[PDB]
Amino acid sequence: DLSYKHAILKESQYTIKRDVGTTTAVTPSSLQQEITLLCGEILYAKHADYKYAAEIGIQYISTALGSERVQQILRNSGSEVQVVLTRTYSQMLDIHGVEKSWVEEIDKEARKTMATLLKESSGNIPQNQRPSAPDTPIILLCVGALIFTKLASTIEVGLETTVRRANRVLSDALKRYPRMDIPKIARSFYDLFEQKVYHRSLFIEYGKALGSSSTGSKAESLFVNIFMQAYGAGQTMLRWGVIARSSNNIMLGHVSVQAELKQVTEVYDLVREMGPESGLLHLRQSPKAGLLSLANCPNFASVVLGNASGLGIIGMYRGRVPNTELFSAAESYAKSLKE
Amino acid sequence: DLSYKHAILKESQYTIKRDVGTTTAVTPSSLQQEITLLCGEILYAKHADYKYAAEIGIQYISTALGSERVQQILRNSGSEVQVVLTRTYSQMLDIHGVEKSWVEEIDKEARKTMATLLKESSGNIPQNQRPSAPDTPIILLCVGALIFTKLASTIEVGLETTVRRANRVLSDALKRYPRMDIPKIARSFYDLFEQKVYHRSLFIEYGKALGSSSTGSKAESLFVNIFMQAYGAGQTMLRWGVIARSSNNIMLGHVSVQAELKQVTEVYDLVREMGPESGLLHLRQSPKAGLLSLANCPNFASVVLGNASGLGIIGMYRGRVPNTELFSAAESYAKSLKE
RNA sequence: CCCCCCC
RNA sequence: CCCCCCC
RNA sequence: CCCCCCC
């Protein structure tokens, strides 16, 4: 059945159309040196409103890939959003859907903070501490990638995890910019990813275009590391299933587990059939996701969760254990094997 | 999963574009006999500012490979830096991005030192002690290659190691040039490698074009020796893992180590799949680096670090030991086997 | 319906 | 996130 | 870094 369902979904002669009357903003590569400034003036000043930081990160992505490539990416993502270009005025940027009041506020706040830290201090600002640093857009996109790995999770868990992991992953940027509010920027990125779902596709295309590069700075290598940490998002049950098989859990040989193993292997075969893009299904909110669910094998899922709980892997996972006896037996065996 | 991640990163139909509006300097081979002088006038005089010594070494590399080949190397490294040629004026060099005041200062300091060591002394300066010696650019690039092997490490460790190793590796040059400041030149090279990441690719291309040569002086053989000592930079955990396997550590047969051995072998298979260029991934800061991390196998990493600590190989390695009990058991077994 | 830990 | 010793 | 004896 599962192969037939995927065959129906894949073999479609008709293309969906959505967001027909909508538009979005991009910034041409000719403005990259400008957007960098903006992407850094968000980082070293303490701003009251961090509402459009995610849009500025996506603007930098658009400068990197190019306006035409970004339009093509949005078009092939199933969304008929018409790209609107970015202009300059007196210079500053007039990004579509980003209020000019916001850009002026961010620029003025950063200029005032820079003046205050230059007047009082000894005037020895290093090359990495200024807003026009060239890795500041990647530093903002690193907060974006941290909150990207938690798009399958909830908002509160995502924000808490982003802040916790960014105090260590982004320690160097925090030292360079003492006053960068990872919570508010992470909230902005979560809002962008939820509202504009095609920007998940744009962000993934940037991740690919960055990982495929021949050279990169440490910021881009960090961004790619986090982006790849997001790969199996929304499918931790499959990873824990292969973990359970590697652990040689005895309760995998139970009668009901052996009964469901056929369709479990069917799900894994479907994973292989989709191939490399299967991992990005839940990140993209591809409607085709959910063909990879193991919820139709309650006993296998309970055994997998029990094995994970025994090994300590389960952590604070919020999934359901359908069959509690199998869960407890598997947990006991996994603890015994671990000890 | 790891093979699929590498397949996504490798199979990209789009090329990244960075440093679009930026430019860099090269020196044509027709100026090599001139740049040599400069590359040696840094070595036998005591200069207040050693800021652009790395750029002068890279200029000599550009003379060696050629301006067009250097432009091609920069282009295939993922960076759209426009090469700017080097000119002469009254002769001395006007290198782009290198202030003429700096070049004049270095030349004047070297001329004054030469006059002082010729007026006071007996006037028996040998052929190797003069700035126009033809191995002086390679002597500077040897300090550059020493600090190249420490690009995965920190700045302070890199500088300390460079000075310590250069007092012995470069003893002959130090005898020839008593006043050459390995600390400041090493700092200059570290700054160049951090700022201009495409120059890592240029420096690697020089290493290849030198190792492939049919003949070479002792300076070039030393440079190639150090360059090859840099090969596995950023991946000492894989080298220590194969060391642990060679040591036949008993704790490799533990339950959790045997659990993680499958994906460990997956990482090693990915290493083989990338092939010869895998070692230069962390040296180049290739964003694709981090696919080779063994951080997702905490128990294997702890056992490997314990084995290294038992054999005395660990030295002062700053990596984390996730599971302390495995680390201590492996260290005890490794010491027992060593004794 | 699906998702949900850690890195 | 990754990296981190010695030669 | 490498090399280092004798014939």
Side-chain angles (χ1 to χ4, degrees), chain B residues 277-299:
Chain B
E277 306 284 327
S278 75
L280 315 165
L281 282 194
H282 278 84
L283 278 180
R284 257 161 176 150
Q285 291 180 176
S286 181
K288 201 162 70 161
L291 285 178
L292 309 178
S293 169
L294 294 178
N296 63 346
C297 313
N299 302 136

Side-chain angles (χ1 to χ4, degrees), chain A residues 69 205 208-209 212 277, chain B residues 7-16:
Chain A
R69 324 291 321 181
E205 289 323 298
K208 297 182 187 174
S212 315
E277 306 284 327
Chain B
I8 293 160
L9 285 187
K10 174 182 41 203
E11 305 317 308
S12 78
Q13 313 94 300
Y14 306 87
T15 74
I16 193 66

Side-chain angles (χ1 to χ4, degrees), chain A residues 46 50 54 62 106 109 187 193 233 307 338:
Chain A
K46 180 67 174 66
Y50 274 95
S62 172
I106 300 296
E109 189 76 29
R187 173 101 190 90
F193 288 135
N307 189 82
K338 183 72 180 296

Side-chain angles (χ1 to χ4, degrees), chain A residues 26-33 35-36 58-67 70, chain B residues 17 20:
Chain A
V26 311
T27 307
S29 296
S30 303
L31 308 185
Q32 198 170 355
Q33 281 285 92
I35 198 81
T36 298
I58 287 303
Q59 287 321 299
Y60 172 79
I61 287 185
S62 172
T63 66
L65 298 185
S67 51
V70 159
Chain B
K17 305 198 191 342
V20 180

Side-chain angles (χ1 to χ4, degrees), chain B residues 63-310:
Chain B
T63 66
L65 298 185
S67 51
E68 303 89 298
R69 324 291 321 180
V70 159
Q71 173 54 100
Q72 183 178 2
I73 286 155
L74 299 183
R75 173 195 329 137
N76 314 130
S77 78
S79 175
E80 300 219 27
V81 296
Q82 281 305 111
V83 171
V84 176
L85 267 193
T86 303
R87 66 213 59 225
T88 68
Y89 68 97
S90 305
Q91 82 185 6
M92 308 205 269
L93 293 153
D94 172 22
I95 311 174
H96 176 75
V98 164
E99 307 155 0
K100 303 162 64 174
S101 71
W102 187 86
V103 167
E104 294 156 15
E105 155 188 356
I106 300 296
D107 172 37
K108 189 211 170 185
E109 189 76 29
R111 298 256 177 212
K112 169 205 310 172
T113 286
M114 178 149 155
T116 300
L117 277 296
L118 208 48
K119 169 199 171 188
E120 316 302 329
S121 291
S122 305
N124 302 138
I125 285 188
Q127 287 302 301
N128 46 65
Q129 294 194 4
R130 34 151 180 71
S132 54
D135 49 6
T136 56
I138 316 286
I139 290 168
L140 197 80
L141 289 171
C142 277
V143 180
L146 274 167
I147 193 66
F148 192 68
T149 76
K150 302 315 279 306
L151 283 185
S153 184
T154 64
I155 179 171
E156 53 262 9
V157 175
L159 290 204
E160 182 65 26
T161 305
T162 298
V163 182
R164 195 211 321 118
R165 290 199 64 204
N167 290 319
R168 321 177 305 238
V169 166
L170 290 169
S171 48
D172 307 331
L174 280 157
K175 289 175 182 58
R176 282 164 50 189
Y177 312 110
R179 62 194 84 71
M180 75 160 312
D181 191 87
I182 306 163
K184 280 175 187 177
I185 302 176
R187 173 101 190 90
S188 159
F189 270 104
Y190 184 71
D191 283 348
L192 183 67
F193 288 135
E194 284 295 335
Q195 288 158 357
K196 317 192 162 194
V197 184
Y198 46 90
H199 278 161
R200 308 186 175 206
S201 291
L202 182 53
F203 190 78
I204 295 175
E205 289 323 298
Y206 187 65
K208 297 182 187 174
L210 209 60
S212 315
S213 294
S214 177
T215 66
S217 61
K218 301 181 187 298
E220 308 181 14
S221 197
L222 175 49
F223 176 93
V224 177
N225 276 352
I226 304 173
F227 169 74
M228 295 296 172
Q229 286 183 340
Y231 179 75
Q235 301 143 32
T236 68
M237 274 301 304
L238 296 181
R239 276 78 198 164
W240 282 358
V242 58
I243 279 181
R245 184 241 191 170
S246 301
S247 282
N248 283 317
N249 205 356
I250 56 158
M251 301 279 132
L252 275 186
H254 208 274
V255 176
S256 186
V257 194
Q258 286 273 131
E260 298 180 347
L261 278 192
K262 181 143 184 282
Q263 189 275 331
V264 165
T265 300
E266 277 198 7
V267 181
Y268 281 95
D269 290 342
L270 178 56
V271 163
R272 281 186 278 282
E273 181 166 70
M274 308 189 204
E277 306 284 327
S278 75
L280 315 165
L281 282 194
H282 278 84
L283 278 180
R284 257 161 176 150
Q285 291 180 176
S286 181
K288 201 162 70 161
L291 285 178
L292 309 178
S293 169
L294 294 178
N296 63 346
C297 313
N299 302 136
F300 178 78
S302 163
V303 165
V304 160
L305 288 187
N307 189 82
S309 181

